[PDB]
């Protein structure tokens, strides 16, 4: 999980398969859908919570009433500073949390795959897996869907691993 | 039989700012700041605003002779003037409580 | 001849974003004025070349 993938444009997170039946990239439906829903909800919550009222910012004053004009300027400057500081901090925190959440999702998918197999795939260290036993399209679909059966291919994986 | 786990990438060059690093490239970003405007005065609440570029509120309400050609609207949402608002009170004088009257006339049902 | 919710003196603003940096003086249900010039939320992944 070092470099990005330009061959996957149907999902933020997904897998790449390659066997005797072909090769390609396939986005994981459930994880991508959950991430999309959560990000959309975050954006909608950020945008919607800004309550707006029919107001008229900016009041004209006479030359004599300079004190009230200075008070209005001070109020406007205070509101501007508060809004700028709060918006900057919110944007920074949200960006950091989103990046951390994406990294956590990738790590969780990797951990889920490793927990599902736990012996069947040699780890290269770059996020890839090398299946000891022969795997077809059905096996790849079962692994991606999460319904992989350990004892069905455990014997074959052990036999292939004990060869070396 | 090789299986790898990766993440989406593209040619997007959008830049975002984080509290730990700056100018980090991301696949997509959402803008929360509006810097584009139509450049035209529209209607608010579906009511046509009044334009008084060649006159002034004092000159309008007082019926200044140079403001006769201006039409009278039944209702408006806000009052718009321009810098060249030299036609106010033609006869010299002081308009007492002018600011309050100016404020009260901004929106009339 | 147009209908909008916010009327900034420079020009009308028809949007739903909570922040705007065009002009502090606004009329209507306008977004709050911010002195900053770049507010972007990172929603996608960290793009890196490969």
């Amino acid at each position, epitope marked *: 999980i070092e470099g990005g993938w330009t061959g996957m444009v149907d999902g933020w997170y997904g897998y790449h398969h390659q066997n005797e039946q072909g090769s*390609g*990239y*396939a*986005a994981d439906l459930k994880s991508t859908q959950n991430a999309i829903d959560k990000i959309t909800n975050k954006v909608n919550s950020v945008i919607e919570k800004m309550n707006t009222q029919f107001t008229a910012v900016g009041k004209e004053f006479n030359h004599l009433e300079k004190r009230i004009e200075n008070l209005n300027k001070k109020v406007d400057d205070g509101f501007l500073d508060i809004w700028t500081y709060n918006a900057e901090l919110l944007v920074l925190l949200e960006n950091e949390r989103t990046l951390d959440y994406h990294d956590s999702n990738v790590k969780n998918l990797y951990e889920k795959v490793r927990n599902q197999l736990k012996n069947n795939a040699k780890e290269i260290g770059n996020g890839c897996f090398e299946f000891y036993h022969k795997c077809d399209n059905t096996c790849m679909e079962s692994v991606k869907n999460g319904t992989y059966d350990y004892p069905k291919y455990s014997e074959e994986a052990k036999l292939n691993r004990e060869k070396i | 039989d090789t299986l790898c786990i990766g993440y989406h990438a*593209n040619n997007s060059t959008d830049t975002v700012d984080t509290v730990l690093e700056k100018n980090v490239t991301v696949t997509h970003s959402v803008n929360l700041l509006e810097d584009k405007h139509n450049g035209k005065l529209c209607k608010l609440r579906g009511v046509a605003p009044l334009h008084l570029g060649k006159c002034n509120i004092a000159g309008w309400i007082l019926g200044n002779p140079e403001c006769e050609s201006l039409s009278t609207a039944s209702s408006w949402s806000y009052i718009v003037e321009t810098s060249n608002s030299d036609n106010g009170t033609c006869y010299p004088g002081d308009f007492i409580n002018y600011e309050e009257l100016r404020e009260q006339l901004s929106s009339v049902s | 001849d147009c209908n909008t919710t916010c009327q900034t003196p420079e020009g009308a603003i028809n949007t739903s974003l909570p922040f705007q940096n065009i002009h502090p003086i606004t009329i209507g249900k306008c977004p709050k004025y911010v002195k900053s010039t770049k507010l972007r939320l990172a929603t*996608g992944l960290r793009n890196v070349p490969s």
Partner: antibody
Amino acid sequence: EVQLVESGGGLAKPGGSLRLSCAASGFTFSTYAMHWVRQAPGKGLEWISGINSGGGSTWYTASVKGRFTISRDNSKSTLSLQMNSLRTEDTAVYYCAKDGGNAIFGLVITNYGLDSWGQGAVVTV
Amino acid sequence: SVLTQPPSASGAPGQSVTISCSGSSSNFGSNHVYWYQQLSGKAPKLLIYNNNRRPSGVPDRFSGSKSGTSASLAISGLQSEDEADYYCSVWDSSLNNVLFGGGTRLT
């Protein structure tokens, strides 16, 4: 306006093999999924198979599993459908179509459906 | 799962007609539906998109709705050219297949 070209039709004896080719232009072929849908002569439509925009995900119905193969090339923007063990029921008009894409933060989410159809290739057994 | 449609529909010119589509509650409610129009010997064209919208070039007289497990397609301002076949398409995740109806004939 997208353009779709379909070829490979003709007459094939029962128990033989056949190949259908679909070419697309006017849109990025690597960002939209594809579907092959058959229609019997005088009957209704019948979805046959499909493949994802980035490949790696082939969807088949119960009546075509183990019989039809889908292979797409994004560099050539071509799609090949290979049919084996042909039967008299296979006589129909096949259509190559693209899928719908939802734009979510610059991401194209595949939606099950067909936006623009091809022209139709008649296969008789 | 299977999809059922009326064998045919009838309507005088200038009136409105309704076409009903039904299916299994497990998949129809969760997923979306599509209505397609096919002429006589012509390539079918999509009419109803995302259960509420329509592609470009589709007249506004067509309308679509989805209540419960039943989808309804309404056609107003019926014309001679509008006489064509209509199909209902859904997606099923239990079988992972695109299901099409038997077709409806409008006259």
